[PDB]
């Protein structure tokens, strides 16, 4: 029940306390709930079937740009806010 705003502020205090992993692990969880990981998995197969040389680098050349675009905008904004909010505690108020 409107738990969004609460969850944000809570995370922020936890990360300050030394719980630094909470950012990366929380990103991971949003990506799984939304299904991002499974999509990248399939997009990878698609690329491999197209060119069919098993090479990792060239296949990463096309999978990576697309992968960064497919992350749901809510996941990117909420996670990017957590990073930004945290960074402000490391660097001067500006």
């Amino acid at each position: 029940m409107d738990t969004a705003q609460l969850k944000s502020q809570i995370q922020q205090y936890l990360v300050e306390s030394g719980n630094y992993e909470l950012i990366s692990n929380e990103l991971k969880a949003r990506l799984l709930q939304e299904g991002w990981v499974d999509k990248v998995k399939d997009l990878t197969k698609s690329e491999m079937n197209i060119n069919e040389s098993t090479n990792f680098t060239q296949i990463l050349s096309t999978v990576e740009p697309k992968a960064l675009e497919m992350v749901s905008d809510s996941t990117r904004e909420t996670v990017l806010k957590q990073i930004r909010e945290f960074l402000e505690e490391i660097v001067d108020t500006q």
């Binding site: 990103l27 990248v40 098993t54 990463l60 990576e64 960064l68 996670v79 990017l80 660097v91």
Partner: peptide, 27 residues
Amino acid sequence: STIDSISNGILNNLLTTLIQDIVARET
């Protein structure tokens, strides 16, 4: 540089680390 440019540097680092792991399995 900027606080937002560093913010984006972190998120990009986190995401492309994951992406790499997924691509490397190749399946």
